[PDB]
Amino acid sequence: CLGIGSCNDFAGCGYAVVCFW
């Protein structure tokens, strides 16, 4: 849940660098 540009943090909330999916 931040505004970067690789994958998603926790189900629709925002972005992630370390990919949960």
From Swiss-Prot:
Disulfide bonds join 1-13, 7-19. The keyword tRNA-binding does not apply. It comes from the Bacteria. The keyword Repeat does not apply. Keywords: Disulfide bond, Thioether bond. There is a cross-link at residues 1-9 (3-cysteinyl-aspartic acid (Cys-Asp)). Active against HIV-1 virus in vitro. This is Tricyclic peptide RP 71955. The lineage of its organism: Bacteria, Bacillati, Actinomycetota, Actinomycetes, Kitasatosporales.
